[PDB]
Amino acid sequence: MSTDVAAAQAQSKIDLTKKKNEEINKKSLEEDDEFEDFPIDTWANGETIKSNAVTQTNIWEENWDDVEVDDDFTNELKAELDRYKRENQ
Amino acid sequence: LHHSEKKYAEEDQVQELLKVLNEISKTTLTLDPRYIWRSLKDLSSLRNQELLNAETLCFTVNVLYPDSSSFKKNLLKFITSNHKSSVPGSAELRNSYPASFYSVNTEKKTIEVTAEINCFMHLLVQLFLWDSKELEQLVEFNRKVVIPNLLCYYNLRSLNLINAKLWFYIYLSHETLARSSEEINSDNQNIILRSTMMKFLKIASLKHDNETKAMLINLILRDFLNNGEVDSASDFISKLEYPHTDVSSSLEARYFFYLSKINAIQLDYSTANEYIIAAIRKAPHNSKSLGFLQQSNKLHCCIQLLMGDIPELSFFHQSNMQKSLLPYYHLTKAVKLGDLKKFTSTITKYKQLLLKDDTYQLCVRLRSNVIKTGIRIISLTYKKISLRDICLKLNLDSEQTVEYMVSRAIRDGVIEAKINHEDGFIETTELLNIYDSEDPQQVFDERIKFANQLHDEYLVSMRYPEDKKTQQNEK
Amino acid sequence: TTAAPLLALLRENQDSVKTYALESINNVVDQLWSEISNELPDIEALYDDDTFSDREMAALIASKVYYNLGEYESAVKYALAAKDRFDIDEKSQFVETIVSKSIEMYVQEASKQYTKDEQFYTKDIIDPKLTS
Amino acid sequence: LTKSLSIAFENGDYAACEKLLPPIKIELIKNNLLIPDLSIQNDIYLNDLMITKRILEVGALASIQTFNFDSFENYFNQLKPYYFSNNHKLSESDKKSKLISLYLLNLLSQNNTTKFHSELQYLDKHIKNLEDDSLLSYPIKLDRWLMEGSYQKAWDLLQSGSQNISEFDSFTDILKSAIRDEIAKNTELSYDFLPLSNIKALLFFNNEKETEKFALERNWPIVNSKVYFNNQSKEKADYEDEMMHEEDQKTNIIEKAMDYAISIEN
């Protein structure tokens, strides 16, 4: 669990005995770890992270899709319906 | 056996205290004491938790105490009393010291230097209460006891730096009790909590302690935000003094994150964006810092939709923070597409969660940005476009209404078009080729100065730790 | 907290609540310092008006506000203008801060005027409160 | 004095309330000292607390209606400590919901949206789902419609509040004056020509004479019944060039290199 590019802050900072208390204090100030509160709070577990292939687990790269609706069914309807107009022209 | 275990924990603590005591006898300093003090606090936080509830008590009894040892013990009575290891041989000592708080000397009262010792016993009682994860009356008793002790005399520079870290815990435990079960006296005591924090900042100004000043500023910003007293915090942030000289990088992370909150409320989305990226890059990647990052990322997505900038889809996918950030991911897709219908679903589906973080207020301002982002997409896509076509796409009213949206929207410059009301279209003004204008001149200048500023910071910092080592004997 | 009830008292048109306002602002001047600094010119208008006997009190507020802002130079001027009500905070365990800056400022002035002639103890460049 | 203000409010006289209030201000000092000022709250300091809220509550609603917005903001500021704390024990009432609704319009009719949104947090903590929005929805809806930019939805919401001649309407007319000014800020970029019948339409006038009258005051040159925004734009640009900002506002070709030069030698 890492914010932006995972490796970019994993190399940027690492643990020290000196820092360890202050870090724990930061997460307590907001009041929780805020990733284990959320399943109880909603009273469900993920199904809406299953929206797209890339959303569930990042084991691909980004497409820049966000609904992932096949565009073959609409392009097929345009193709045939246009021909007929020209046939009846 | 049982005496050995409490004695071992005590001996760890003694070496850390003795180290600082020696350092402040030569000449009081700020930073060299702190690095040791931070290492001790970690060990105490881990030993209080893991090893019984009476390992603090042994120490407290062992040293001379104004009345603290009895106030410590009270807390332990409630959760099943302790009485063990307070007989001589835990109270017939004051624990190896050369002569400055040694057993023989202190009891004899040839010296008494309870000065440093009292501040550290405070540090234990705060740690021990957050370890227990308990609140009630014990909080009140912690508030009452330590504050006037520290206010009935001025502190030395070293002692002021211990007492800055106690103020955070007092504040945090009061605020959690309200969130477990709200009460009616928690509200009236909050005025009391409020009074001490600002009065503290004045006290630290005279001692000229850089690290003490910074940590109190972080507290005042947080305290205003949960009370929602933003008005008073808006006066504060234009009249600060923060140093970045000796502060830890956790303090700096927090400071920038607070600004981003207040700024976003004042409808500054451009300054808020700069500072929230600052806060994240200081913070670690760790699960230690996890909860700090979630609240930060919640705000970071929100600022971008307020601008019209629209976060990355990658950003949720590269982190494993997906489920926390699930409501902002549904807003991201909604504003981009222009679909109000998608947007209205998101804010009803997840209302409860948003309202918990008190970021719901910020989220309703986004019903506007769908409409304004929708007109910018339509002006990109068609250079000239009828009024009616907009009304179909974004599910709006008359064309007269749509005219008004654009007239207002180009006062900020969101659409960057202009309306012809006798020609009946909307004509955008972009047709790039600004490299034939004088614009890049202005830009390159700024990047050059940005580089100059990083050079300067490099100069002062590079030699200051170098200087400490070369002076210091190690030959 | 908020300083907003306190501003309203100055603005309220009766004599009586204007006298009480200076007392109320001054109690918690270390809590609400950043708030009341914006509207410190309101308090300067009450110093002008001669319908107050808390003129001295109004001036005293200004000192504590300017120290927390960062300018120590301005605070000592207006501490000297207040006249008395500044001899009670020389031994507190909380605020001696405004006082100590006076000891510094006399040393700066003292060097400058000694060189002209040894006497400078009858110059009006040195305030009589400052010497005390 | 003290109970006399209450019944003067009730009758419908508000010139009566303000006349009589400077006497009661002295006794408001007496009341304030009876409570510790909310350090602890008994049922005895509850009795005292009602006295303190009462003088100020009725003073502040009355201020609006004599068109002393300045005085309104003074009384309202005084209520705030009681409003803050001790909730669910004589701190929250029907009058409170009415009084805060009116204040949010005050900040908005002054045209400070900096303040309005920062004041809204403070209220988040208090009632907005503990006494739900039924009168506080009004100022929040309005602020939103001008942020998307729809002046249609905004004028309508004001016009149906004009049906309700109470004291909410005293801030509605200010807010209809404000919609005109905003549009008059926009129209400079938006067009260059509008016929006079068209200017009337955007500025929400029903009278063509009324349009011409606003133009004098708002400094629009309508010549032969057509406006010239390009002239107005010039004047305002000219003013902005005049003021001292000006070397590094433009940023001179020479000035850039001079900066670079001394940095490498320093």
Q: How far apart are CA B167 and CA B126, in angstroms?
A: 9
Interchain proximity A23–B253, CB inside 8 Å: no
User: Can you tell me whether residue C1 is helix, strand or coil?
Assistant: coil
D84 touching C (Cβ < 8 Å) = yes
Distance from CA of D95 to the nearest CA of B (A): 21
Interface test with B, best of C24, C31, C32 (most B CBs within 10 A): C31
Taking the C-alpha atoms of residue D214 and residue B375, their distance in angstroms, rounded to an integer, is 31
As a dihedral over the C-alpha atoms of residue B91, residue B93, residue B95, residue B99, rounded to 10 degrees, the angle is 140
Closest by Cβ to C12, choosing from D25, D81, D84: D25
Residue D264 lies in a domain: no
Structural tokens at position B73 = 């013990």
Nearest CA in chain D to B224: D122
Q: How far away is chain D from the Cα of C20, in angstroms, using its nearest Cα? A: 8
In a domain, D242, yes or no: no
Measured in angstroms, the CA of C17 and the nearest CA of chain D are apart by 7
Looking at residue D43, the DSSP 8-state letter turns out to be S
Given a contact cutoff of 8 angstroms between Cβ atoms, the answer to whether B313 and A64 are in contact is: yes
Q: How many folded domains does chain D comprise?
A: 1
Interatomic CA distance for residues B161 and B211, integer angstroms: 7
Which of the residues D76, D147, D180, D191 would you substitute to probe the B interface, choosing the one with the greatest number of B C-beta atoms within 10 Å? Answer: D147
Tell me whether residues D118 and B420 touch, CB distance under 8 A.
no
Q: In degrees to the nearest 10, what's the CA dihedral of D140, D144, D146, D147?
A: 140
Write the CB contacts of B463 (distance below 8 Å, at least 6 apart in sequence). Answer: none
- Alpha carbon distance, N-terminus to C-terminus of chain D: 74
Residue of C nearest to D76 (CA): C5
Core vs surface per residue C15-29: b (16+ CB within 10 A) or e? ebbbbbbbebbbebb
Residue D224: which region, alpha, beta or left (left: phi > 0; alpha: psi -120 to 50)?
left
**Burial profile B146-180: b = 16 or more Cβ within 10 angstroms, e = fewer:** bbeebbeeebebbbbbbbbbbbbbbbbbbbbbeee
What backbone phi and psi angles, to 5 degrees, belong to D65?
-80, -20
Backbone angles phi, psi at D40, to 5 degrees: -150, 155
User: Are the beta carbons of A21 and B38 closer than 8 angstroms?
Assistant: yes
Q: Which of the 8 DSSP states describes residue D67? A: T
Question: What is the distance between the alpha carbons of residues B297 and A34, in angstroms, rounded to a whole number?
Answer: 12
CA Rg value for chain D? 25
CA-closest candidate to residue B297, choices B326, B268, B270: B326
Q: Which of C126, C79, C71, C70 is nearest to C98 (CA)?
A: C79
Q: Is D166 helix (H, G, I), strand (E, B) or coil?
A: coil
Smallest Cβ–Cβ distance between A30 and the set B292, B314, B317 belongs to B292
Contact of D171 with D102, CB cutoff 8 Å: yes
Instruction: Give the residue among C3, C89, C83 at the shortest CA–CA distance from B202.
Output: C89
Task: Give domain status of residue D119, yes or no.
Answer: yes
State the angle between helix axes of A17-30 and B31-50 in degrees (0 to 180), rounded to the nearest 10.
70
φ/ψ of residue B343, rounded to 5: -65, -50
Angle, CA of B327, B331 and B333, to the nearest 5°? 120
CB B54 within 8 A of CB B82: yes
Residues spanned by the domain of D17: 1-230
Contact by Cβ (8 Å): B294, B323: no
Report if residue D240 sits inside a domain.
no
On whether any CB of chain A is under 8 Å from the CB of B310, the answer is no
| Neighbouring residues of D99: CB distance < 8 A, sequence distance ≥ 6 | D57, D60, D61, D76, D79
- Closest residue of B to D88, CA-based? B184
Please name the residue that has the structure tokens 């234990």: B124
For tokens 């509160």, what's the residue?
Answer: A37
In a 13 Å sphere around the CA of D96, the CA atoms on its Cβ side amount to 22
Environment class of A51 (CB within 10 Å of its CB; exposed 0-12, middle 13-18, buried 19+): middle
Contact A18, B42 (CB under 8 A): yes
**Contact, B64 vs B114, CB < 8 A?**
yes
Chains D+A touching (3+ CB pairs under 8 Å): no
Strand, helix or coil for residue D223: strand
- How is residue D260 written in tokens? 């670079």
Report the gap between the CA of C22 and the closest CA in chain B (Å): 18
Number of Cβ within a 10 Å radius of residue D11: 9
- Residue linked to tokens 């180009």: B410
Of D25, D29, D81, the CB nearest to C5: D81
Domain ranges of chain A: 23-89
Nearest to B317 among A35, A41, A55 (CB): A55
**One-letter-per-residue 3-state SS of chain B:** CHHHHHHHHHHHHHHHHHHHHHHHHHCCCCHHHHHHHHHHHHHHHHHHHHCCCCHHHHHHHHCCCCCHHHHHHHHHHCCCCCCCCCCCCCCCCCCCCCCCCCHHHHHHCCCCCHHHHHHHHHHHHHHHHHHHCCCCCHHHHHHHHHHHHHHCCCCCHHHHHHHHHHHHHHHHHHHHHHHHCCCCHHHHHHHHHHHHHHHHHHHHHHHCCHHHHHHHHHHHHHHHHHHCCHHHHHHHHCCCCCCCCCCCHHHHHHHHHHHHHHHHHCCCCHHHHHHHHHHHHHCCCCCCCHHHHHHHHHHHHHHHHHHCCCCCCHHHHHCCCCCCCHHHHHHHHHHHHCCHHHHHHHHHHCHHHHHHCCCHHHHHCHHHHHHHHHHHHHHHHCCEECHHHHHHHHCCCCHHHHHHHHHHHHHHCCCCEEEECCCCEEEECCCCCCCCCCHHHHHHHHHHHHHHHHHHHHHHHHHHHHHHHHHCCCC
The alpha-carbon gap from A38 to the nearest alpha carbon of chain B, in Å, equals: 7
CB B322 within 8 A of CB A55: yes
Which method resolved this structure? cryo-EM
